[PDB]
Design an enzyme around this catalytic site. Structure first.
Site, PDB file in Angstrom:
ATOM      1  CD  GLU A  85      -2.754   1.058   2.517  1.00  0.00           C
ATOM      2  OE1 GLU A  85      -2.231   0.653   3.563  1.00  0.00           O
ATOM      3  OE2 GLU A  85      -3.935   1.396   2.444  1.00  0.00           O
ATOM      4  CD  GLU A 176      -5.901   6.658   4.732  1.00  0.00           C
ATOM      5  OE1 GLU A 176      -5.395   6.410   3.639  1.00  0.00           O
ATOM      6  OE2 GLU A 176      -5.571   6.067   5.764  1.00  0.00           O
TER       7      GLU A 176
HETATM    8  O1  LIG Z   1     -14.406  -5.839  -1.123  1.00  0.00           O
HETATM    9  C1  LIG Z   1     -12.986  -5.725  -1.015  1.00  0.00           C
HETATM   10  C2  LIG Z   1     -12.595  -4.312  -0.578  1.00  0.00           C
HETATM   11  O2  LIG Z   1     -13.092  -4.010   0.733  1.00  0.00           O
HETATM   12  C3  LIG Z   1     -11.080  -4.152  -0.605  1.00  0.00           C
HETATM   13  O3  LIG Z   1     -10.735  -2.806  -0.394  1.00  0.00           O
HETATM   14  C4  LIG Z   1      -9.491  -2.327   0.121  1.00  0.00           C
HETATM   15  C5  LIG Z   1      -9.419  -2.551   1.620  1.00  0.00           C
HETATM   16  O4  LIG Z   1      -8.173  -2.051   2.091  1.00  0.00           O
HETATM   17  C6  LIG Z   1      -8.108  -0.639   2.002  1.00  0.00           C
HETATM   18  O5  LIG Z   1      -7.151  -0.359   2.552  1.00  0.00           O
HETATM   19  C7  LIG Z   1      -7.042   0.277   3.832  1.00  0.00           C
HETATM   20  C8  LIG Z   1      -7.216   1.778   3.622  1.00  0.00           C
HETATM   21  O6  LIG Z   1      -6.776   2.502   4.759  1.00  0.00           O
HETATM   22  C9  LIG Z   1      -5.395   2.314   5.046  1.00  0.00           C
HETATM   23  O7  LIG Z   1      -5.334   3.377   6.043  1.00  0.00           O
HETATM   24  C10 LIG Z   1      -5.177   0.866   5.482  1.00  0.00           C
HETATM   25  O8  LIG Z   1      -3.804   0.512   5.734  1.00  0.00           O
HETATM   26  C11 LIG Z   1      -5.712  -0.124   4.465  1.00  0.00           C
HETATM   27  O9  LIG Z   1      -5.833  -1.387   5.139  1.00  0.00           O
HETATM   28  C12 LIG Z   1      -8.206  -0.226   0.539  1.00  0.00           C
HETATM   29  O10 LIG Z   1      -8.306   1.199   0.492  1.00  0.00           O
HETATM   30  C13 LIG Z   1      -9.402  -0.847  -0.177  1.00  0.00           C
HETATM   31  O11 LIG Z   1      -9.248  -0.734  -1.582  1.00  0.00           O
HETATM   32  O12 LIG Z   1     -10.632  -4.415  -1.927  1.00  0.00           O
HETATM   33  C14 LIG Z   1     -10.855  -5.784  -2.279  1.00  0.00           C
HETATM   34  C15 LIG Z   1     -12.357  -6.026  -2.366  1.00  0.00           C
HETATM   35  O13 LIG Z   1     -12.614  -7.375  -2.774  1.00  0.00           O
END
Ligand SMILES: O[C@@H]1[C@@H](O)[C@H](O[C@@H]2CO[C@@H](O[C@@H]3CO[C@@H](O)[C@H](O)[C@H]3O)[C@H](O)[C@H]2O)OC[C@H]1O
EC number: 3.2.1.8
Length: 189
Positions: A85, A176
């Site tokens: 990420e 965010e």
């Molecule tokens: O349905 C599923 C979705 O929910 C999935 O989405 C991602 C989930 O992780 C997210 O990441 C977080 C965002 O915030 C940061 O601060 C964190 O470290 C992360 O964990 C991301 O933004 C979403 O895209 O995608 C897959 C689908 O199947």
């Protein structure tokens, strides 16, 4: 206004995710524009861009960003294999996301020096489910809400430092927030 999820709107990929606490409204506008309005929200990320992104994209963004609390404005995305990420942070609210993080160098790009860091998320949500993965960061020293980001400068600097990216997944300009308030209106190209 839309439900959390992904898709395309006016030629641009978008991703909007939240924790369900409420308090955040994400809106897709014309072209590459999107807006976010939040008040005592939970955790959330939303923005427009591309799916998949590339390692040499020049991303332009412009607008207004007014957080009241914990929030970031970044080029934001993920890679697969390895799962990463990443963030090119252009502005933030009350919290610099690199606080207490290990500094992995510096890179100069698009009018400012950026500090580079690597952090780790343990058993957290991701694009492939719950997992442990690293996060790469370039944090801009000169905050702004408009500009141009030459992603290659960041990705190359990261690679030089041992922060390698795999195959690119989505890549967007994202607002965010983590249990905060604010408003933002951003146009991407
Ligand atoms: O349905 C599923 C979705 O929910 C999935 O989405 C991602 C989930 O992780 C997210 O990441 C977080 C965002 O915030 C940061 O601060 C964190 O470290 C992360 O964990 C991301 O933004 C979403 O895209 O995608 C897959 C689908 O199947």
């Amino acid at each position: 206004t839309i439900q959390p999820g992904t898709g395309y709107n006016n030629g641009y990929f978008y991703s909007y995710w939240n924790d369900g606490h409420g308090g955040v409204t994400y809106t897709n506008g014309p072209g590459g524009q999107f807006s976010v309005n939040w008040s005592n929200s939970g955790d959330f990320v939303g923005g427009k861009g591309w799916q998949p992104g590339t390692k040499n994209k020049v991303i332009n963004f412009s607008g207004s960003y007014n957080p009241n609390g914990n929030s970031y404005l970044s080029v934001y995305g993920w890679s697969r294999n390895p799962l990463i990420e990443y963030y090119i942070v252009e502005n933030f609210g009350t919290y610099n996301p690199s606080t207490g993080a290990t500094k992995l160098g510096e890179v100069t790009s698009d009018g400012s020096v950026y500090d580079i860091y690597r952090t780790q998320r343990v058993n957290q949500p991701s694009i492939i489910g719950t997992a442990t993965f690293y996060q790469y960061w370039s944090v801009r020293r000169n905050h702004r809400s408009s500009g141009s980001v030459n992603t290659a400068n960041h990705f190359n600097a990261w690679a030089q430092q041992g922060l390698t990216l795999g195959t690119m997944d989505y890549q967007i300009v994202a607002v965010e927030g983590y249990f905060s308030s604010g408003s933002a209106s951003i146009t991407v190209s």
